[PDB]
């Protein structure tokens, strides 16, 4: 796991035990209001992040209710499963939605983090490309006021360095976690896909759990894809 401090320009490379202590520190710094610009490199095999760059019809943030976010989780999981990469059995994967604080001149954004589902970069690009054939996702975004529902998912989401939670550019404010969902898929019951909001998200180390390269989270336990 490699970390980039865009403020000090320095780079890092930590082990599991160290990372958690690294993330323990960063988490402390987060709950103290410190401004951070930490990025993690996705590498070639890690969690998935979807970066949505929204152009809006008005200058007000979309509502993005949990009912809508739950719908997007289902659609995103369909394209994940369609990549034919999930392992057999019953497994728990988590979706996290971090949102831009405010709409600025009609521009808005949100990130969908599935940090525990470790997969290859080629698999991520296939899912990202497949997610743009999805008329249901486009309609959902359209009903939210998004002016570019056909071109809002950044194709480089599979390779761009990913901001750690609480980090931002020296000019911008960091994205804020709105809610997170728990999805359970079972190869012995493929039609059953329960999606529910995670209980007590605030009780976890958010920097650690949402990390795409972390494998020692408490809530987010890794599920390795083919
Ligand atoms: Mn963005
Ligand atoms: Mn982008």
Per the CB < 8 A criterion, the answer to whether 44 and 118 are in contact is: no
- 3-state class (DSSP) for residue 18: helix
Resolution (in Å) of the shown entry?
A: 2.0
List the one residue out of 201, 209, 207, 204 whose CA is nearest residue 167: 207
The total domain count for the chain is 1
Q: Is 156 exposed, middle or buried (CB count within 10 Å of its CB: 0-12, 13-18, 19+)?
A: exposed
Which two three-digit tokens encode residue 96? Answer: 């996290």
Annotated binding site for dCTP: 169, 175
Which uninterrupted H or E stretch holds 22? helix 16-30
Contact 124, 115 (CB under 8 A): no
Q: Are 90 and 186 in contact (CB under 8 A)?
A: yes
Residue 206: domain span: 2-224
Is residue 202 classed exposed, middle or buried when 0-12, 13-18 and 19+ CB atoms within 10 A define those classes?
exposed
| Experimental method of this PDB entry | X-ray
Q: Which amino acids are annotated as binding site for Mn(2+), given as ranges?
A: 51, 53, 154
Query: Do strands 223-224 and 107-120 pair parallel, antiparallel, or not at all (unpaired)?
Result: parallel
Q: How far is the CA of 99 from the centre of ligand 1 (A)?
A: 10
């Amino acid at each position: 796991t490699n970390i980039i401090n865009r403020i000090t320009g320095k780079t890092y490379a930590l082990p599991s035990t160290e990372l958690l202590r690294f993330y323990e520190h960063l988490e402390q710094c987060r709950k103290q209001g410190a401004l951070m610009y930490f990025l993690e490199r996705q590498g070639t095999y890690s969690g998935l992040m979807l970066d949505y760059d929204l152009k809006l019809n008005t200058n007000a943030a979309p509502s993005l209710e949990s009912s809508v976010l739950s719908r997007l989780c289902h659609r995103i999981f369909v394209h994940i499963k369609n990549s034919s990469v999930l392992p057999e059995g019953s497994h728990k994967i988590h979706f996290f939605f971090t949102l831009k604080p405010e709409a600025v001149q009609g521009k808005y954004g949100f990130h969908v983090l599935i940090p525990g589902l470790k997969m290859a970069a080629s698999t991520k690009k296939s899912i990202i490309a497949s997610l743009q054939h999805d008329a249901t996702v486009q309609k959902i975004l359209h009903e939210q006021g998004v002016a570019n529902p056909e071109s809002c998912l950044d194709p480089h989401s599979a390779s761009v360095p990913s901001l750690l939670y609480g980090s931002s550019k020296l000019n911008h404010r960091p994205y804020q976690l709105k809610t997170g969902f728990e999805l359970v898929f079972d190869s012995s019951d493929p039609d059953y896909i329960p999606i529910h909001q995670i209980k007590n998200i605030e009780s976890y180390n958010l920097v650690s759990e949402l990390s795409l390269t972390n494998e020692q989270g408490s809530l987010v336990r890794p599920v390795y894809c083919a």
